[PDB]
């Protein structure tokens, strides 16, 4: 009944990004959020340098129209600090700092070498081939603003400014547990209707790959005392508390009252598939996210709901939800109007090199294989009905969490 | 001069994937390559259960034709217990175990639920709507073959089988260093023709994000004895040695002779842009990859050549290279025949909800900004010339290394 979009916006609207920060060497900053703007302590380039390989000359020396001999050479790591007499030019390479008095640089193309010096074939105007210092980055300028997630694209640049460490927002702490006498750990036989806990591992892995600091409390016994203790512990040491399954997501039971008791939790019924129920609210010192017990549902819900909540909490200002694109289906998709169906598919190129999606197979939540077989979600509109081969469909490629 | 594909193909043909292994608890296996086939200890599902919400029936009872009174129900965690009188049906839900003797399940939508029984009119086929024990995974079957990179898609499935740990191939160890008197560390003012070492950090970051174990030896002093010692140290403890800059990639100097003295190293001239040079070869106990000093070229080269090399080395059997797709340029692209130009672009959805690339701006290798501003590579074919707006283009979306 409640739309995903409405649920998302309600959650996020309530959240305040972390501000706590720590300063780390750049090599430790991958995927981290800059806590403060990175302001350039220098100019890039530093010294006006040559745009190409050629000769640094003077407009007066060129005037003589006489083949002027090379008084010396200036290289990137070997700036020329020599004499540079009247009728002479300075051999230079790109990036190499331009010698004092330079007015322009000429490429070795518009230049011909004679026994009495370089003879300039073309015209030479001031500024020519000279990279103006600080033209790419001026000292005192903001290179990267606070909120930027540091990547291989940004970190090397910060290093290029001679900066060793930058301040980053601390990692989001996420407490995680599951509960239910039916949940069993590996190596232990499956009791009556016991199953192996899988949601907890799934969430744990995703949290870690999202750069969160995970506090896994494991499986909490179906006991008010154990559950309440877990909640109090989690809430006291993390920013987000997640029940990977076992805690009520609507149905009344002792877990639900502990919930109602420790915070203001809403029990949503989302117009999505797979899944539907999702618990969310403020605990005393944390945000709580309760996932349905079904593995496919829990994974999907986490991916479409908790992930963007964590993104906001992190301080990341990269406003937006994962890229989606219109694509044709090579597959017939069964779809019931009424729910935004996040089916799984395989995005691939057809003979003509165009992208297309095929179903992974059965879309039931009784199996998990679709996550491995697939590489994307086929996000079928809420009101949409069955999809025939060739129809335009919205596709959202899986992120790194699924490979 | 030499084609990227040819270079890459040749590099990969010489490499043998690591085999050394370690057994780790599933939570520590993200991104890791399965060392041995994961065999299923159980049947999935574990018992015959219903594919739908409906009624469990017997072919003979339907054959009788009279409405079938509901004798009971079987749900999720509670199979149907007690006798199943003849001429009756058991109410059932998806996933619930099918009652003893059940030969078929009929979806409620095909039935007329009346006060004195359920009227069945549709033909009923034996086995219909019954999910048989082990139809998804049968005990003794390989669930994931050795070579599989473990993700949130695979790990939870392994957990569901009650398996706590799996054998994964050890991380590829990569020794990293750069050299040159110009190279400066952060915090220290730039000397004569000095610059801040940025390639090393870049490579380090990627290596780590690629799951490799990095041995960063730092900046080696411009000395043959120091360099020689560096190689020895690097080669003795790593599977791969990478010079992020400073060691010769073709040009003769003291570094090139050390290279020639410590192993069989090829100095390639790649028909690509940016970049061109790349040193590759077998050292005594490792593979060596030497990158050009230009930041843009080094990153690109690492990205398009070293990354794939590391992937094969890891034992990952996932065949293929980064995903590419045909897209229209919303930008005119300056392209020169001769080199495979990996320009940086911005792939985004247009008004018509269609995907399209825009150049990030100046494509020169003197600036690093294009990696931050872009989100993809516009892979302009070697022979291709200038590209006019609206032309079909190859795009390779950036992977996580750049966000």
XYZ file of C-alpha atoms in Angstrom, chain A residues 26-30 42 44 47 76-79 81 131 135-136 144 149 151-157 159-164 185-188 190 196-199 201-206 208-209 216 299 324-326 349 351-355 362 364 366-369 371-373 394-395 400-403, chain B residues 26-31 42 44 94 131 135-136 144 149 151-157 159-164 181-182 185-188 190-194 196-199 201-206 208-209 216 299 324-326 347 349 352-355 362 366-369 371-372 394-395 400-403:
148
model
C 45.075 9.342 1.959
C 45.816 5.624 1.432
C 43.176 4.942 4.128
C 40.552 7.189 2.622
C 38.988 5.076 -0.094
C 49.339 25.543 -4.132
C 48.583 23.728 -10.536
C 55.427 27.325 -12.668
C 60.371 18.495 -16.503
C 62.690 17.425 -13.689
C 65.564 19.595 -14.916
C 64.510 23.276 -15.079
C 68.639 28.119 -14.995
C 50.671 26.575 -19.413
C 45.267 27.591 -14.384
C 43.939 24.138 -13.469
C 36.951 18.863 -3.352
C 33.278 10.330 -1.315
C 37.931 7.529 -4.730
C 40.914 6.817 -6.972
C 39.722 9.842 -8.911
C 40.099 12.292 -6.024
C 42.749 10.920 -3.688
C 45.663 11.033 -6.114
C 44.751 14.686 -6.798
C 48.257 13.936 -3.047
C 49.292 16.082 -6.014
C 48.886 19.054 -3.687
C 51.276 17.587 -1.203
C 48.509 16.811 1.278
C 49.143 13.710 3.422
C 24.158 -21.300 13.023
C 26.232 -23.598 10.792
C 27.439 -26.945 12.049
C 24.271 -27.318 14.132
C 18.128 -27.952 11.858
C 20.298 -21.574 8.826
C 20.588 -17.862 9.475
C 21.416 -16.291 6.151
C 20.005 -12.792 6.300
C 25.448 -12.717 6.859
C 23.944 -11.044 3.820
C 23.370 -7.768 5.612
C 26.761 -7.985 7.344
C 28.583 -8.387 4.053
C 26.691 -5.539 2.487
C 30.994 -3.944 5.283
C 31.224 -3.386 1.569
C 27.262 -8.241 14.763
C 18.111 -8.433 0.830
C 18.722 3.251 -14.052
C 18.224 2.925 -17.786
C 15.523 2.082 -20.307
C 24.514 -6.864 -25.350
C 24.175 -9.053 -31.695
C 23.703 -5.409 -32.648
C 25.562 -4.380 -29.499
C 22.411 -2.994 -27.862
C 21.691 -3.698 -24.203
C 11.696 -17.892 -11.507
C 9.887 -16.311 -6.438
C 11.848 -19.096 -2.280
C 15.259 -19.128 -3.939
C 18.245 -16.711 -3.842
C 19.976 -17.746 -7.061
C 21.048 -12.521 -7.257
C 23.969 -14.521 -8.504
C 22.508 -15.275 -11.935
C 13.484 0.131 -16.451
C 16.710 -1.598 -15.447
C 29.388 -4.071 -6.309
C 27.482 -5.771 -3.483
C 26.491 -8.449 -5.947
C 29.620 -8.307 -8.091
C 32.042 -16.670 5.142
C 31.893 -13.135 6.502
C 35.508 -12.642 5.489
C 35.050 -13.977 2.008
C 33.729 -11.004 0.125
C 35.541 -10.619 -3.132
C 21.342 -30.746 1.700
C 16.849 -27.415 -1.501
C 3.281 -21.206 -0.957
C 8.030 -27.914 -5.622
C 14.719 -29.347 -7.284
C 16.681 -26.123 -6.750
C 29.515 -22.842 -6.638
C 34.281 -14.730 -6.792
C 29.680 -11.855 -3.249
C 26.484 -11.154 -1.315
C 24.883 -13.239 -4.002
C 26.847 -16.358 -3.205
C 27.892 -16.184 0.413
C 24.419 -16.228 1.955
C 23.526 -19.225 -0.186
C 25.354 -20.031 4.698
C 21.918 -21.449 3.967
C 23.561 -24.844 3.487
C 24.928 -24.676 6.981
C 28.516 -24.171 5.815
C 30.507 -21.810 8.076
C 64.778 12.328 -7.568
C 61.885 14.562 -8.625
C 56.429 13.050 -0.336
C 53.595 15.181 1.116
C 54.399 17.899 3.644
C 57.762 18.567 2.006
C 58.758 20.914 -3.853
C 62.471 20.970 -4.676
C 63.994 21.932 -8.031
C 61.999 20.054 -10.639
C 60.207 18.122 -7.932
C 54.453 14.992 -5.464
C 54.338 11.250 -6.036
C 50.735 10.528 -6.931
C 50.899 7.404 -9.094
C 48.969 6.260 -4.082
C 46.674 5.765 -7.035
C 47.945 2.282 -7.726
C 47.936 1.465 -4.018
C 44.287 2.441 -3.700
C 43.211 0.416 -6.679
C 43.555 -2.613 -2.228
C 40.109 -2.099 -3.696
C 54.301 -0.407 -0.639
C 46.127 5.048 -14.119
C 30.673 -1.920 -22.601
C 27.633 -0.494 -24.342
C 26.868 1.390 -27.564
C 27.045 8.830 -19.388
C 19.935 9.810 -19.112
C 13.890 11.021 -23.655
C 15.132 8.841 -20.806
C 17.915 7.686 -23.114
C 21.580 7.198 -22.217
C 39.787 18.605 -22.220
C 48.140 16.982 -18.225
C 45.089 17.091 -15.957
C 43.595 14.407 -13.721
C 40.128 15.987 -13.335
C 38.478 10.783 -13.728
C 36.475 12.633 -11.099
C 31.433 2.625 -27.282
C 31.241 3.416 -23.587
C 34.158 1.154 -8.244
C 37.781 2.305 -8.429
C 36.496 5.683 -9.624
C 33.115 5.619 -7.902
